[PDB]
Amino acid sequence: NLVINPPVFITSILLIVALILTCVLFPEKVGVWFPAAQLAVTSNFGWFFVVTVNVILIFAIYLAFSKFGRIRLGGDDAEPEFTKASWFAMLFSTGMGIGIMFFSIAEPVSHFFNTPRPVDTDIEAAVQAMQFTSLHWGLHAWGIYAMVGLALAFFGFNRKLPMTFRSLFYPFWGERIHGWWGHIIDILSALATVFGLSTSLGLGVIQITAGLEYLYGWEISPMMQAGIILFVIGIATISVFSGLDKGVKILSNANMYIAASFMLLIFILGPTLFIMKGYVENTGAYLANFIDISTWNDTYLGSGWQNVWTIFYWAWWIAWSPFVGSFIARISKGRTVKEFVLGVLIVPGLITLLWMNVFGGSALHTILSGDVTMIAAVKADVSTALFVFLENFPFTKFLSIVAIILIFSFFITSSDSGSLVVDNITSGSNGESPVWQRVFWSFAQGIIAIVLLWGGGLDALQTAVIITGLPFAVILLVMCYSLQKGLKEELAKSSK
């Protein structure tokens, strides 16, 4: 069929097509325009990104510990479909850990040899690297995700509105969200979702290509990368055509089991005691200097370090929100607002910090021992780092194959989930859309990832996600205030 939203489907399709045509028809003009635009946006609005993420996290904490914390999503009589532990495990499944696998070793090592701030000795460099990795992957990312998921769940369960970003502004837009005011927000949400998913797909493909090159010595041309992307998208859409939700839903739990086994293997075969001590000490130091690193803007040095690491991560989380928050809201019916915020903030953040310690802190322990091949490997390219890390463990080939397969399956699950989210947002059917729409959205994500990889690689992904996450940072602030207003309305309506 053609179950679409005419103002959203059309606008998103021609915007994506126009960007693709600009990228391909202008091979060299875009290669200089994109870095300039990304640099301008980062330099002029890093303070705004920092303020946005801090305000969103503070708002989530305040909502958890206020009179709104007793509000139960889906109604007062609504009952959770899962237990607390299973819900926590499921919450540490919407994180889409392709970036986790890409950065777990690369980011701490890069911060070690390219320090955010000047340090005296290597010990302080390692501590700072762990602190900034914790900042980038800790409370702020999951706070943004918790806020967006809470808004979506409250407006799709308590208010019965469709779980689309246009409805999230109902409290002070009234019925005005039906044309060129909720349409623009819907278009921006679809674009930000598509570009965050394309960034993740490109990261996964880059890491898979690097792993194949490192293991089997192959020469993976960009045409081979495009063929890989097309093959994976096709094999993911085959499940959508025939056999929906299987074996894709079970893949989401198989991925978590495999990732837990991988992390446990690295924890046991690595410096286990060092990993535990470093986990405790690094979490304590991250919480101790939380306000210092969260509000840091590199004002006086002006090194431009945040333009690639911190501002990029904030923009990535903000642009990824309409997807991670959507899947967080889908599985969270019957939870109270306080319990929801706590269970999205603490446990997923703690597990992310544990993974970051087990991998990056072990890498830094290896580096501090005098083994600096990993620093050179990261400097040469950021993609191979994990595999170089696995060179320091038994069963290096088996571990690398397992990691590549894990990245492959994460890519499949993220592609399917993002196609579902983008189709639901754009069409507005919320489940009544045909299969071909989801297949086309998967194709669009794959094509955008291919085009970005050809026209810059990782830099193109960073540029796209930052550019599409700035206006969505504004939208997220407005959405946070709208969610507060809606929670006030619900509290006033109840407690008669």
Added chain:
Amino acid sequence: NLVINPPVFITSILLIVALILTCVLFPEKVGVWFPAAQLAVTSNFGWFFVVTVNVILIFAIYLAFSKFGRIRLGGDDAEPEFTKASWFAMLFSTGMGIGIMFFSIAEPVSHFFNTPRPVDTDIEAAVQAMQFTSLHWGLHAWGIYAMVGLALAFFGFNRKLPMTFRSLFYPFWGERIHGWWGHIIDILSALATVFGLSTSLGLGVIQITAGLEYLYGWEISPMMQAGIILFVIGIATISVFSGLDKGVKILSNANMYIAASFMLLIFILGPTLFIMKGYVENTGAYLANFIDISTWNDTYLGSGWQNVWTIFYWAWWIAWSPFVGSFIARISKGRTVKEFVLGVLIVPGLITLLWMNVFGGSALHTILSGDVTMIAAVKADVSTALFVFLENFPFTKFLSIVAIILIFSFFITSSDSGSLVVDNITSGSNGESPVWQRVFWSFAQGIIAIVLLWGGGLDALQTAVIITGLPFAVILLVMCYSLQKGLKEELAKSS
């Protein structure tokens, strides 16, 4: 028409005249007695000032988030006279600030080239300078002001007692505060208020004289400074006797609008992106190291740096507390204790930190760029610093004239407001007395400022502030506990 409180008015006049006579008749003896006394008080009770300001701020925060936060000033009838958005702007003490114009640039530059604690890099020196400027002008000053305004509002609105400092001890001293026990507290409050006002007037005159000298090289003599003070006080006297609003209360938000326009111009013509990033980062670092710098006492180095900056600022806020808290309480009827404390704490402190960033952080950016003329200017005399800062902007002369006019208007507003507060303290009932007493109190403030400026300048103002703020720090702690008891008994009374 002599409506006065005898053993407040007479006693305060006697002490003021006695100090004036001691200062004039003993030119050189006072010039060595006052610095020694100030050094002794600062060295021996800097820890006490630190403890007092920390306890007052913690008490204000606790009262905001306790069961007393639901208590509404003026009873449950509510009906505040102003909206919250306008109340936040109206909450800037009695004015946007003379001291803020004096120390917007001079203090950060001084902390840059005279660091409170040892630092290794100029970047760290600038960060520390901004952190200590934020400490001195941030949450502690407005916490003291919020506590005093809350006490005055609660005891003048919920209990209908006169808005004098002796009533604030009614829950503790019972009815006993009506002779030689509330009289002493009233005398100390009047003296501390008068000396804080005199310090502000002296700072304003010093900065105006420095600006005139910098702009035109007029070589303003101390006699000309006294003439300027007399002319300003005469202008304030002309404002009164004619129904006011000529005058005073008309330079608001006219003063507020002029100050906001000045800050906007400096923010735009200066480094805008640097100012925004520095504001965010400096506020975050000031909150991150709040307990480290608030409780810091310079114990191990013993450099004596706090004697001129930190302890002086705490004593200044403590002594200024009656004056600021009077109007903080006056225009805050019908607001809950929690809302009042939050609105006096966050927004005024945040905008003060924004002003400090826009001016001092821009100056520090200029210094870190390589231009170190402001360091030399501040070392020669802090008074010219702002004007030297304005040398790095377009329309330097116009901006300097605007700043001088702003200081002049703040002078008039603060003088009239302080005269009103001191008249209320020494007379009572808030209706009396005839305006001649207010004129006399304005004359007294001007004369005290003149005498202190002749007998030491800024150092004399700091000495008077510290000496009159130590016993008032003790009084402020006692007042905080008495206000807590009064709030508890009001909550218990409302069954």
Added chain:
Amino acid sequence: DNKNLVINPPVFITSILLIVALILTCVLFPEKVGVWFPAAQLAVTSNFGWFFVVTVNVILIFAIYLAFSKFGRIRLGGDDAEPEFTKASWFAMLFSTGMGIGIMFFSIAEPVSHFFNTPRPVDTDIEAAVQAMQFTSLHWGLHAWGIYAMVGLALAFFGFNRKLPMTFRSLFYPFWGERIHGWWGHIIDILSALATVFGLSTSLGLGVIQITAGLEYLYGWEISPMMQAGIILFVIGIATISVFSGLDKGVKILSNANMYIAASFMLLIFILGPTLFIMKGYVENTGAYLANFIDISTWNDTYLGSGWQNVWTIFYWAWWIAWSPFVGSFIARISKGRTVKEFVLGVLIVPGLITLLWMNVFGGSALHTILSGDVTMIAAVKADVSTALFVFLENFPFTKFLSIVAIILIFSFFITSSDSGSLVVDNITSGSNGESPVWQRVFWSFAQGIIAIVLLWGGGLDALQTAVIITGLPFAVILLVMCYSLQKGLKEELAKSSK
């Protein structure tokens, strides 16, 4: 053997056999024990310092949470129960039950040791002094009193609201219910008795070491280990004699006199020392301790790996954990009719603040003397750690009188420690609350003295550290389980109430 036995088997039997077995191992295998105890202590510290840090942090966070949760309104001993003493007197009594022996041993020695042997690298001596004061505050501040507050709160709630016996097996009633009558509550009771006995033996050994060092410093005597054993026997004598001749109030009055004498000693050192420096340092050091609370509480020395925590931080956490039953018993005994929030706040803030004030008055004064240029105390602490206070007292008027007063204070603290710990261990072992014959608690005091003698002969302070660490390793797990058991019990009481 007859009616003169109110022991609870097999806690009596198992505890006595374990103590006797360790005593025989120590006295029959000198080289074996001398090579095994340091190795076992090093292994435990290295492998579970992170766990000790996590345990103390979780216990303190749980205490703060219980203070400010819905359980803060629960009144121990019933909703109608009234406090036995006033708030100020109760606060004064709460700054006790640590016996002060550790605080007199480490008042000067710990800050000086952290000054010349820094936990972390520092550039200037000012930073070294600040770090020494910060880590001293960490070791003697909120974490120790948080452990004590949690244990005392559990004991008070389960011995007053639930009327269960004030042993550690009852604290797990909400989790196992009725399984605590054999080999499950028995093992927990045995471990609690052993940890209490070894913590009290550590305190007694510290007191004896300090007294011997003070006598050597003052009168130049050569106190042989035989003389140390004689001193311990004489104390576990005269104290047993006091116990025999109905002197239950004679130890309470002794404790009150000890508190007054310690307050006078602290005031004298505060006045005759750098008073202004002490006040400024107290304010600044408390502020710095609170400012870097999470930094130093969670610090594990992961990257340097210097092993510094194995002797200072992990030892202190293990000591507090294995020493918390004895402290919490008397913290709970005097806390009837007080709300959970009020109890936690009054055990956390005021005793911690007074301990930090004492540590400032002594250690910060010593650090001021060192920074002035007098480094005799550094050399004295390096030579031996037990003379430091007396060397410190060499910088004050009436040095001999102050040293004699300190020695007498340590001796009286030793008597109070012996009596109180004997009572606690007798109550735990025999089960009945103060119903066993006096000979049982006399034998427990004798056992404490013998264990202290054996540990002092077989290593000295290192042996005491090893014993307390080994016995506090499983008790950290026990305390972690007991925290959640107490939370479940508080939830059960809240649900049972509001009827």
